[PDB]
Amino acid sequence: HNHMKDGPYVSSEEAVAIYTTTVHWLEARKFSPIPFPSVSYKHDTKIL
Amino acid sequence: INDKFAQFSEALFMADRHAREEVRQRAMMQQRLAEKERQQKEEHLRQLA
Amino acid sequence: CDPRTNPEFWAKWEQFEVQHGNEDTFKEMLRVKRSVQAKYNTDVNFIASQALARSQM
Amino acid sequence: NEWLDPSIKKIEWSREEDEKLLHLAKLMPTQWRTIAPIVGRTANQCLE
Amino acid sequence: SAMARESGAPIRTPRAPAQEDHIANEIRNIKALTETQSSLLGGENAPLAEGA
Amino acid sequence: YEKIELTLLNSLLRLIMDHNLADYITAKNNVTLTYKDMSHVNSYGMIRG
């Protein structure tokens, strides 16, 4: 209830700085984003 | 609820869009160097040939 | 006002809308009519509606 | 809690509730159980 | 007029602008800022239309 | 765990993976916790379970 009333404690500039830090780190390591699990994707059954 | 939530969300959305734009520019900038480098190597090979 | 007990007022409102109104205000008046007609679906108001409906005949 | 509670509005939606619902769904993405008390319906009603 | 003698019909509501349809505006804004994939991929940002 | 903002978490999860997975995870962390006759919606912080 106090979070609903007193707003997001993470201020907007803090969230933006954290987001841009994550963006710069992830492009620096050339990270390929995880796709949705496709329809066929054989490994599915083993993962299941 | 507090108003700051809206401002919070707005910032993230703009930040997200900005990041994507920057990435795209850097990405396309990179490929320019890539093809330029390829051309240079090809030219060198032609000279060597 | 009740739509199924006071239809003349709704007729006058539609007349005012066709003299002065648009399709957006007309859709608003349909929405308010549907919401009010849904609101007055109580047992006592249904009883009153049927009582006046068979009283006028 | 989702159907039989007498505080649940089963009538068709208004335009004001549509404006509030879309505004809040833009504010808090996929936080539907948060949006539902503010909008005035349940979470599945707002989602659908 | 008395000293000379002695000697549109309807009114219109302005129409709501088509760009100011706030419901469809928020629809296309959420569709722009929700189905957008990871920002590391790059790609064109969806054109959000706000008008005023 | 207490101080995870679910909107920022949704944005960072959208960064690493597909937006459907991020939306599922953030909607999963916003549930109603019930113990006996007590019940409340968890809109702030993550669910460790």
Give the gyration radius of chain D's Cα atoms. Answer: 10
Please, what is the Cα angle at B23 between B19 and B29, to 5 degrees?
A: 150
Chains that touch C (3 or more CB pairs under 8 A): D, E
Residue D42 dihedral angles phi and psi, to the nearest 5°: -85, 180
Which among B1, B4, B10, B12 is the top mutation candidate for probing chain F, defined by the most F β-carbons within 10 Å of its own β-carbon?
A: B12
Three-class SS state of A34: strand
D44 to chain F, any CB pair closer than 8 A? The answer is: no
Q: How many CB pairs under 8 A join D and F?
A: 28
Tokens 């335009």 map to which residue? D15
Report residue F37 CA to chain centroid gap: 23
> Measured between alpha carbons, how far is residue B42 from residues B13, B38, B48 in Å?
44, 6, 10
d(CA F4, CA B25): 32
Find out whether D47 and D32 touch, Cβ atoms under 8 Å: yes
The 10 Å CB-count burial string (b at 16+, else e) for E11-31 is eeeeeeeeeeebeebbeebbe
Confirm or reject contact between E40 and chain F (CB < 8 A). Answer: yes
F8–B12 CB contact, under 8 Å: yes
Q: Which two tokens stand for residue E18?
A: 């088509």
Q: Closest approach of chain D CAs to the CA of F28, in angstroms?
A: 9
- Out of E33, E36, E42, the one facing B23 most closely (by C-beta) is E42
E35 at the F interface (CB within 8 A)? yes
Interior angle at CA E43, CA E42 and CA E45, nearest 5? 105
F17: three-class secondary structure by DSSP = strand
Beta-bridge partners for F34: F39
Q: Could you give the dihedral angle defined by the CA atoms of residues B13, B19, B24 and B25, in that order, rounded to the nearest 10 degrees?
A: 120
Contact partners, residue B49, CB within 8 Å, separation at least 6: none
Are B21 and E45 a contacting pair at CB < 8 A? yes
Residue C30: count other Cβ atoms within 10 Å of its Cβ: 11
| Nearest-CA distance A21 → chain E (Å) | 13
Reference C24, options A21, E22, E52, F1; nearest CA is E22
Measured between alpha carbons, how far is D48 from E21 in angstroms, rounded to an integer?
21
Nearest residue to D13 (alpha-carbon basis) of C38, C26, B1, C17? C38
Q: Rg for chain E (alpha carbons), in Å?
A: 26
A37: how many CB neighbours lie within 10 A of its CB? 13
Nearest CA in chain C to D10: C38
Q: Is residue B6 exposed (0-12), middle (13-18) or buried (19+ Cβ within 10 Å)?
A: middle
Cα separation, D35 vs D17, whole angstroms: 12
Burial class (CB in 10 A: 0-12, 13-18, 19+), D35: buried
Nearest to A12, CA basis, from B14, D33, E31, F13: B14
Q: What are the chain B neighbours of F7 within 8 Å (beta carbons)?
A: 8-9, 12
CB contact under 8 A, E13 and C19: no
Neighbour count for residue E9 (Cβ, 10 Å): 3
Which residues pair with residue F32 across a beta bridge?
A: F41
How far apart are alpha carbons F7 and D31 in whole angstroms?
Answer: 8
Which residues of F fall within a CB distance of 8 Å from E32?
none
List the single residue in E with minimal CA-CA distance to D27. Answer: E30
| Structure's resolution in angstroms | 3.5
Q: How far is A10 from chain F (nearest CA, A)?
A: 7
Determine contact: C22 vs chain E, CB below 8 A: yes
Q: How far apart (Å, rounded) are the C-alpha atoms in residues B20 and A17?
A: 15
